[PDB]
Amino acid sequence: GPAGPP
Amino acid sequence: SFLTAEDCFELGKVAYTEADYYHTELWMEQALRQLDEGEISTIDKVSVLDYLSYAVYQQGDLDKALLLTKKLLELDPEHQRANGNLKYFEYIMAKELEHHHH
Ligand SMILES: [Mg+2]
């Protein structure tokens, strides 16, 4: 699954 | 009193941290629009697109999220998460086309 900034 | 591109980006990060992904998009795109009009500023587009692509994904706009990830990867080909995001989107897209071939 996609990962955004923390 | 008014908002610089830096301000817009900071407001976009406030929106993002509250999972306001539409407002994230509005502020981040406004940051980019101020840059494109020749506003002098020190923010980096790579970071802007990182938030923006994730926010657009949250809205279910997969095509536009992919677009933005590719724009990020043109500016920073190293970028670890964008590279992972790209692989994800390409996987999904490869799956769609696999389905239509069956
Ligand atoms: Mg909170």
Side-chain angles (χ1 to χ4, degrees):
Chain B
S1 166
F2 72 94
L3 298 172
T4 69
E6 195 199 28
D7 298 333
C8 292
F9 177 55
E10 289 301 321
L11 291 171
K13 291 211 301 303
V14 173
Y16 178 84
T17 52
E18 295 315 324
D20 234 27
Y21 297 117
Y22 187 85
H23 272 73
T24 302
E25 179 189 356
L26 290 181
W27 287 123
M28 292 318 184
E29 284 177 349
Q30 182 63 16
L32 300 183
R33 263 203 301 301
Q34 287 174 206
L35 289 190
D36 262 48
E37 296 160 4
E39 203 213 59
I40 182 65
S41 162
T42 62
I43 63 196
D44 90 324
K45 290 179 59 168
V46 170
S47 186
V48 177
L49 287 163
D50 191 10
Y51 285 90
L52 182 59
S53 63
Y54 191 79
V56 168
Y57 166 69
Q58 287 289 324
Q59 301 177 42
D61 295 343
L62 268 275
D63 292 351
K64 176 178 161 31
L66 174 60
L67 248 72
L68 292 168
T69 303
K70 295 198 301 184
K71 288 173 173 163
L72 191 165
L73 282 168
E74 286 162 52
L75 301 172
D76 184 354
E78 157 196 290
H79 194 280
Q80 290 263 261
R81 279 191 291 79
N83 271 285
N85 294 345
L86 180 54
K87 278 150 50 231
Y88 171 79
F89 297 129
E90 286 188 341
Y91 172 84
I92 300 304
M93 282 204 307
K95 212 69 198 154
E96 289 170 44
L97 202 57
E98 164 186 13
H99 185 244
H100 304 324
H101 283 14
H102 284 94

